């Protein structure tokens, strides 16, 4: 039955999670009460991937909601689809984590992690055949970052052969809540390097530049960024949520996308970003455009290890193949020659709400090193003077752990560079 | 009468099996409920079609077939489709979780838990045979199950039925219809492990079938249903001699005797003509000479390669429909005077020819037109080694970087197995060069 | 842009073709092992023809015909001539030749013991010197046409381009590669005509013509002034006939009309002219170079007729 | 050319045309190999879980 368990941790994680659930619930014809009111059996044909079936012939998201503070989960429960979530799947503490990875991972978070794992186990136990997990969170705060990576580590320990996938919002000084975000992000990337199979790098810098430059929004809110995130996530889960030609599970996708275990950080993109119907050439050109990428990295500065393209809507598969081939053949130097046929294409007949045609892009590119270099420089700029370290050592962390995290991330960068020059 | 057991492994093998058994039912006059009104012997018989169908006391004609996939989604369509009544449930075996395009997961991790059940169900069918000839094994090279479980299975069938012939029908990977980067690893790994266990293997390149569907059936974007119906026509041409009265290729052993003098060089090239669109409203029917000529055009081959630049070791022609020997012999004389057909020196220059009078069957509402005569050529030519070269080149490109190797090692396969299989492929290419070329 | 790869670093002809293609805007060169090419300029040795034509959405073209080696080696050419009924042992326009290995024509050639001067290659009248030299033994043309001024032997090189449609195009410019020593019946310097061999061992290397190369305008003028005929009538009819017969013989074996990749190839036919203005085929070269003076023009012709014909952008040949 | 071994039945005929004359593993070994692979798997899993137990002890020390 190929069940996925979804986990959203912290403020960012839970807001983007909520948008994800409202968007896909709309695609599957599920209303806020959990009743199906769609027009097509394809909407229900693979519904069990993300939704449990309840007695009242209710479909309930297979979703666990975690935070160290209550605020955001009250806001979820009051949100438009808030009644659809299982009440027992809300697991919240009272203390908060103060944007402090050490509080999320070692002190405040550890007290709550067991109760979160109990709910994960209760959901998995009733799965016909759990394929694995997806987590939504930011890396810049304390709960999603520190407690999220703690959760990931515990899930790996108890489900070591299951796929662990994250949608991870990466911090940027252009959209910043605290100065300590690079510390929290550096500590978290190391964890993801060890304990996830796939991590979608969603950079608030890129989301901001898209809202501002392309969408012409002078003052973009978190709501505007999360609209892009939810549309991207809908796109990336399309190929498993709707009927079609592909017999896939998270492991087959991972095996096709991840050539080396540590290099599993993907750039997502979306097109189109208006009433003019978009031709296949236009979707194809825009989905590969730097300006559509959500991890503010120039793909012309690296090479593609692998690419997945997912097209949604009624269109010519012939025309799709021709345009995808055109972009690969005309830009062959940006695709590594030593992985043949490394661009894969999926088509789903069902378009998202409002757009007639859309494309979602997943790239495993060596250019993602630019993101980690960015974070590393901000980390070093502080860590060379030990600035703000007392917030962390006061929760029991040693300087040594920071030095090791910094080293792990410079090694990740060096590995990406090795494969970019090969 | 001597039985043949068909084994369909993984998605490609199962769906091709579906197309083949549908076609066999139409050819033999067997309905979807299993009844065969033309069969006047109720509940038994030693007719030629009983090589492929057993009979119940209620008159049901039951394929001698096992379907085997490690996830349930493809076989469930068989369980609920038009021919659900044809097959006994114990013939249809599914696990819960597939091999994720990973040879190691099919062969070692998952295969270890289903192999005894599969061999037991196969044994159940064998105990119903009075003179079991062997097995017809349908699978992809590219899937985790089609590659790894199939090779595991072939080893065990060699242990449990060591005297019995085993034939393969193998789907060779094409980027135009496949969605995985690691298909070259799996293909090389399975060919290495299956070689000395397979007596004769018919490779079908999805790229060739794709292009035939596009060019000759005017299909803009062929689906698996199109590809499998065409493939099933070719499979039916190959097995017709086992299923109908006749004097050529009447036993699994004869495929090896006629087509394979070198046991490792056991990959015959199939070429089929004519393929004509059902929608083509004006079709001028093609003569024996034209279709036999078609047999020597690369565009009609199941693997794109150039037989002019290798050598033949054997060649035979299976005609269906309105064909008499005189027209065959005139066609062969003409083709010999017009085309580059070079045999190795130690094999006679010659064709074994089989003709089956019943015309080819097509699936109603299908993409193929009914024709008055058709032909399948099975030729053992060294030119087929071009496909191994292509696959080996892709393997070398990825393995030099160890790309994706960790997925296989993490399932418990050792890295040495990669270079052992690759070495064996290098030796296969060398065998084909020594047989096929001169300085 | 169309895309191409270069895999033979020593080809002068295709180095110039490559540089021409680049100077269009619409061609990009790739690293030698990137498979996403429209056009392969292949290596001379063991070009991987089995890997061509398997890239969805790319029309692929290569500058060699697989199987043309049969025409472009001495033993394979002798065998093709003797064994193909359209050519036959009595070809008349090819010298009597026998394959000899160190299906060995040793005795079959010996039966031709008895003008008995022969050449062994891959020059004497006693067989023992030659068969004790180890290849093909070929009747050596004892009465060559000798140009008056300098009484000197020569050979004619013709360039021929075969396109993907198997049109056979004869480049209108040929070249005579001359000796500049008098021809003697009695020391391989007055007998041979290789460009290198004259620009080294032979003393006079330039006296009569530049680089021992004479072009059609001069040779035609000489044939008019000395023998009262033209190059077209006296020699070129025979050249065209020979080229057409050779390539039409192998067309079924090598054509790419119905194949999944397309081929073209540039050939260099070498001819000898005897004192009766009879033309003899000496050699077919599968990877010729060109005379300096004509590179620019010939390479442009390859782009026009062989490459842009398949990959069009936004006559120096005679069609045979 | 020469046509030999002509056979004929109501369903067809066959024959041959000559244009020119001429000129192991045991079940025990399989079981061992599969079990060695399974042991490697078990070993990788134990390495992972040992690394995670080291992480748990570090968390308690923090
Ligand atoms: N001709 C043909 N090829 C198929 C078909 N289905 C899959 N393939 C090819 O098979 C390869 C994928 O292998 P699958 O059969 O789907 O994999 P599997 O054996 O089921 O193993 P798993 O990885 O466990 O699913 C690709 O190269 C596809 O092109 C089919 O129905 N017909
Ligand atoms: N049968 C014959 N009679 C007279 N002269 C001959 C001959 N065969 C060869 N020659 C002379 O020997 C020269 C070189 O011979 P050949 O053509 O075998 O060399 P080659 O293999 O290098 C081809 P090329 O030098 O043009 O690339 C010819 O130019 C010709 O002058
Ligand atoms: N894109 C996006 N980023 C957010 C959102 N909320 C917070 N962030 C970012 O996440 C980081 C703060 O982490 P936060 O989720 O608030 O901390 P936590 O809840 O304690 O885990 C900062 O980098 C913010 O820019 C959101 O709704 N969308
Ligand atoms: N790796 C990868 N790729 C994806 N894109 C599409 C694709 C189609 C065909 C392919 C292919 C990829 O690769 C081989 O053939 C989606 C995902 C994903 C991630 C996280 C959660 C998810 N819930 C559902 C899906 C999914 N993960
Ligand atoms: N071989 C392999 N695979 C990996 N991920 C996929 C996988 C999951 C479950 C599996 C499996 C493979 O095999 C069967 O169960 C990670 C690793 C690894 C090793 C050592 C250090 C590491 N730091 C980051 C990663 C990593 N090594
Ligand atoms: N995420 C992930 N996966 C891994 N896969 C290997 C694997 C093999 C067989 C399996 C299996 C997993 O699951 C059950 O069978 C290794 C690791 C890792 C990372 C970092 C340091 C490490 N030191 C030891 C290990 C490890 N991290
Ligand atoms: Ca506390
Ligand atoms: Ca009966
Ligand atoms: Mg915050
Ligand atoms: Mg499958
Ligand atoms: Mg020569």
UniProtKB/TrEMBL annotation, chain C:
One of its GO terms (biological process) is microtubule cytoskeleton organization. Catalyzes the post-translational addition of a tyrosine to the C-terminal end of detyrosinated alpha-tubulin. Pfam families: TTL (PF03133). Belongs to the tubulin--tyrosine ligase family. Its EC number is 6.3.2.25. This is Tubulin--tyrosine ligase. Mg(2+) binds at residue 283. InterPro entries: TTL/TTLL_fam, Tubulin-tyrosine_ligase. One of its GO terms (molecular function) is tubulin-tyrosine ligase activity. PROSITE patterns: TTL. It comes from Gallus gallus (Chicken). Its cofactor is K(+); Mg(2+). It is an enzyme of class 6 (ligase). GO terms for cellular component: spindle microtubule. It catalyses: C-terminal L-alpha-aminoacyl-L-glutamyl-L-glutamyl-[tubulin] + L-tyrosine + ATP = C-terminal L-alpha-aminoacyl-L-glutamyl-L-glutamyl-L-tyrosyl-[tubulin] + ADP + phosphate + H(+). Keywords: ATP-binding, Ligase, Magnesium, Metal-binding, Nucleotide-binding, Potassium. Monomer. The keyword Protein biosynthesis does not apply.
């Amino acid at each position: 039955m190929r069940e996925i368990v979804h986990i959203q941790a912290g403020q960012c994680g839970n807001q983007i999670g909520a948008k994800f659930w409202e968007v896909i619930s709309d695609e599957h014809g599920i209303d806020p009460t959990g009743s199906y009111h769609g027009d097509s059996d394809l909407q229900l044909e693979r519904i069990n991937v993300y939704y449990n079936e309840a007695a009242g012939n209710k479909y309930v998201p297979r979703a666990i909601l975690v935070d160290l503070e209550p605020g955001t989960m009250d806001s979820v429960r009051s949100g438009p689809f808030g009644q659809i979530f299982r009440p027992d799947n809300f697991v919240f503490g009272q203390s908060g984590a103060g944007n402090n990875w050490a509080k999320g991972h070692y002190t405040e978070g550890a007290e709550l992690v067991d109760s979160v794992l109990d709910v994960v186990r209760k959901e998995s136990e009733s799965c016909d055949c759990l394929q694995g997990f997806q987590l939504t969170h930011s890396l810049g705060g304390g709960t999603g970052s520190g407690m999220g990576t703690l959760l990931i580590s515990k899930i790996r320990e108890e489900y070591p052969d299951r796929i662990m996938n994250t949608f991870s919002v990466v911090p940027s000084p252009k959209v910043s809540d605290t100065v300590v975000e690079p510390y929290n992000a550096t500590l978290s990337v190391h964890q993801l390097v060890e304990n996830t199979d796939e991590t979608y790098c969603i950079d608030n810098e890129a989301l901001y530049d898209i809202c501002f430059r392309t969408l012409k929004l002078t003052t973009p809110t978190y709501g505007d960024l999360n609209h892009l995130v939810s549309a991207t996530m809908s796109g990336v889960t399309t190929c498993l949520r709707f009927p079609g030609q592909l017999n896939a599970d998270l492991r087959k996708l991972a095996v096709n996308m991840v050539p080396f275990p540590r290099l599993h950080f993907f750039m997502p993109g979306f097109a189109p970003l208006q009433y003019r119907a978009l031709t296949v050439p236009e979707l194809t050109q825009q989905m590969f455009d730097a300006k559509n990428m959500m991890a503010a990295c120039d793909p012309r500065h690296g090479r593609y290890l692998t690419v997945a393209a997912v097209f949604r809507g009624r269109m010519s598969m012939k025309e799709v193949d021709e345009q995808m081939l055109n972009v690969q053949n005309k830009n062959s130097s940006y695709f590594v020659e030593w992985i043949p046929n490394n661009v894969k294409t999926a088509v789903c007949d069902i378009p998202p709400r409002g757009l007639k045609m859309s494309a979602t892009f997943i790239g495993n590119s060596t250019a993602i090193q630019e993101l980690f270099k960015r974070i590393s420089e901000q980390f070093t700029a502080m860590f060379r003077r030990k600035a703000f370290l007392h917030w962390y050592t006061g929760e029991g962390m040693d300087e040594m752990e920071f030095t090791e995290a910094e080293s792990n991330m410079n090694d990740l960068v060096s590995e990406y560079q090795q494969y970019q020059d090969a | 009468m001597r039985e043949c057991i068909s084994i369909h492994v993984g998605q490609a093998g199962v769906q091709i099996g579906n197309a083949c058994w549908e076609l066999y039912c139409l050819e033999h006059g067997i309905q979807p409920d299993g009844q065969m009104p033309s069969d006047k012997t109720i509940g038994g018989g030693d007719d030629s079609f009983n090589t492929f169908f057993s009979e119940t006391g209620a008159g049901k004609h039951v394929p001698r077939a096992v379907f085997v996939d490690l996830e349930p989604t493809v076989i469930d369509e068989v369980r609920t489709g038009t021919y659900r009544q044809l097959f006994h449930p114990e013939q249809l075996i599914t696990g819960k979780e597939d091999a994720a395009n990973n040879y190691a997961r099919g062969h070692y991790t998952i295969g270890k838990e289903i192999i005894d059940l599969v061999l037991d169900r196969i044994r159940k069918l064998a105990d119903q045979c009075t003179g079991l000839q062997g097995f017809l094994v349908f699978h992809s090279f590219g899937g985790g199950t089609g590659s790894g479980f199939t090779s595991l299975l072939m080893e065990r069938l060699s242990v449990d039925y060591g005297k019995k012939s085993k034939l393969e029908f193998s789907i060779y990977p094409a980027p135009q219809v496949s969605t995985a980067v690691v298909e070259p690893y799996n293909s090389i790994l399975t060919t290495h492990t299956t070689l000395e266990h397979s007596d004769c293997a018919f490779m079908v390149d999805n790229e060739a079938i794709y292009d035939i569907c596009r060019r000759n059936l005017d299909i803009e974007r062929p689906t698996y249903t199109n590809l499998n119906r065409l493939i099933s026509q070719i499979v039916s041409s190959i097995t017709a001699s086992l299923r109908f009265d006749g004097a050529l290729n009447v036993d699994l052993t004869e495929f090896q005797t006629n087509l394979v003098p070198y046991p490792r060089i056991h990959f015959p090239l199939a070429t089929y003509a004519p393929v004509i669109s059902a929608e083509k409203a004006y079709h001028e029917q093609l003569s024996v000479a034209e279709i036999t000529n078609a047999c020597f055009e690369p565009a009609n081959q199941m693997v794109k390669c150039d037989p002019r630049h290798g050598k033949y070791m054997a060649c035979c022609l299976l005609y269906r429909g309105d064909v008499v020997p005189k027209d065959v012999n005139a066609a062969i004389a003409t083709i010999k005077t017009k085309r580059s057909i070079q045999f190795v020196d130690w094999c006679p220059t010659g064709f074994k020819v089989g003709i089956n009078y019943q015309p080819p069957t097509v699936v109603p509402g299908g993409d193929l037109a009914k024709v008055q005569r058709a032909v399948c050529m099975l030729s053992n030519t060294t030119a087929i080694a071009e496909a191994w070269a292509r696959l080996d080149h892709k393997f070398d490109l990825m393995y030099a970087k160890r790309a994706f190797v960790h997925w296989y090692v993490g399932e418990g396969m050792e890295e040495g197995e990669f270079s052992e299989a690759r070495e064996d492929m290098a030796a296969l290419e060398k065998d084909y060069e020594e047989v096929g070329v001169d300085s | 842009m169309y895309t191409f790869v270069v895999r033979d670093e020593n080809s002068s002809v295709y180095a110039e073709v490559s540089r021409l293609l680049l100077a269009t805007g619409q061609w990009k060169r790739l690293r030698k092992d990137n498979p996403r090419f429209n056009l392969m300029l292949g290596e001379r040795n063991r070009l991987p023809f089995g890997r061509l034509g398997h890239e969805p959405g790319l029309v692929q073209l290569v500058n060699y015909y697989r199987g043309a080696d049969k025409l472009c080696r001495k033993a394979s050419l002798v065998k093709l001539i003797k064994t193909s009924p359209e050519l036959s042992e009595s070809c008349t326009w090819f010298p009597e030749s026998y394959v000899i290995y160190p299906t060995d024509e040793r005795e079959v050639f010996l039966a031709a013991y008895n003008g008995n001067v022969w050449i062994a290659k891959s020059i004497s009248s006693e067989a023992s010197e030659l068969l004790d030299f180890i290849h093909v033994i070929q009747k050596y043309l004892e009465k060559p046409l000798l140009l008056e001024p300098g009484h000197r032997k020569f050979d004619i090189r013709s360039w021929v381009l075969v396109d993907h449609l198997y049109n056979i195009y004869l480049y209108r410019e040929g070249v005579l590669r001359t000796s500049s020593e008098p021809y003697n019946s009695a020391d391989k310097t007055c007998h041979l005509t290789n460009h290198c061999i004259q620009k080294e061992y032979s003393k006079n290397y330039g006296r009569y013509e530049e680089g021992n190369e004479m072009f059609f305008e001069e040779f035609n003028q000489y044939l008019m002034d000395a023998l009262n005929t033209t190059l077209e009538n006296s020699i070129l009819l025979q050249i065209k006939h020979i080229i057409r017969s050779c390539l039409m013989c192998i067309e079924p074996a090598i054509s790419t009309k119905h194949l999944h990749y397309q081929s073209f190839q540039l050939f260099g036919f070498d001819f000898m002219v005897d004192e009766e203005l009879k033309v003899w085929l000496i050699e077919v070269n599968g990877a010729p170079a060109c005379a300096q003076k004509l590179y620019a023009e010939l390479c442009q012709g390859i782009v026009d007729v062989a490459i842009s014909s398949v990959f069009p952008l936004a006559s120096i040949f005679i069609k045979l | 050319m020469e046509v030999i071994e002509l056979n004929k039945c109501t369903s067809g005929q066959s024959f041959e045309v000559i244009l020119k004359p001429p000129s192991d593993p045991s079940l025990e070994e399989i079981q061992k190999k599969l079990e060695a692979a399974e042991e490697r798997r078990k070993y990788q899993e134990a390495e992972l879980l040992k690394h995670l137990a080291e992480k748990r002890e570090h968390e308690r020390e923090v």
